[PDB]
Amino acid sequence: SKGEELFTGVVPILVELDGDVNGHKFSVSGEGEGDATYGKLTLKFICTTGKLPVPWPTLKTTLVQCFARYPDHMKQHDFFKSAMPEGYVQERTIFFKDDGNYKTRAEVKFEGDTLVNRIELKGIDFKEDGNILGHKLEYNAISGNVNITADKQKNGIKANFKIRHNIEDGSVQLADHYQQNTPIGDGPVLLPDNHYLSTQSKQSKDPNEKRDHMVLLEFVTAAGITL
Ligand code: NA
Incomplete structure (x- = not known):
């Protein structure tokens, strides 16, 4: 695709998220850079409204699969870059087992040289004293496979995957993710064969930063089709 060309170097990233979970409204801004040749993302996210009212790990999947x-041998399957620079809309529902759900809508597109992810997030049906609002999740590394399928009807893709968040008591909190992506333009995109993105991250802190924030180092690699 011509879009793929926009990603051959290091690209600045800007993320903006407006969230409302159970009435607790918050905003997050993120900045960093992506190097798709190596599947590599380095970002710092800041809560710009004060303290984040949900755990940072619950927002990792929401906060640029391009x-x-x-x-x-799989580059004909890269929907995400093929939709660039006009971009795509990504929507998810994230079901936290035995708790509430997040619904998200993200628009991912270039603004000049910067890849921008603008997100709205709504959470409903959460327990004030459950694992999410009651801050019971661990901050350990999240990894897994995002299973992608083509959606010819919307000229896009669907995806599904589960995140198993470790909880303090030693069990896990499931977060079942359902995803759709639709291009913004009218033209053709790459509609992929079934495959997955193997995704891993590590969370850290900026020692100089006094605001509530998370630093993320992430690697994302498409896989599952053999040469
Ligand atoms: Na690159």
Whole structure:
């Protein structure tokens, strides 16, 4: 795709999120850079409204899959870069087992040289004393596979995957993710064969930062089709 060309170097990233979970409204801004040749993302996210009212790990999946490293033999399956620069809309529902759900809508597109992810998030049906609002999740590394399928009807893709968040008591909190992506333009995109994105991250802190924030280092690699 011509879009793929926009990702051959290091690209600045800007993320903006407006959230409302159970009436607790918050905003997050993120900045960093992506190097899709290596599937690599380095970002710092800041809560700009004060303290974040949900755990940072619950927002990781929401807070730019156009930065995945696609193997050469799979580059015909990279929907995300093929929709650039006009971009795509990503929507998810995230069901936290035995608790509430997030619904998200993200618009991902270039503004000049910067890849921008503008997100709205709504959470409903949460327990004030459950694992999310009651801050019971661990901050350990999240990894897993995002299973992608083509959606010819919307000229896009669907995806599904589960995140198993470790909880303090030693069990896990499931977050079942359902995803759709639709291009913004009218023209053709790459509609992929079934495959997945193998995604891993590590969370850290900026020692100089006094605001509530998270630093993330992430690698995203497409896989599952053999040469
Ligand atoms: Na690159």
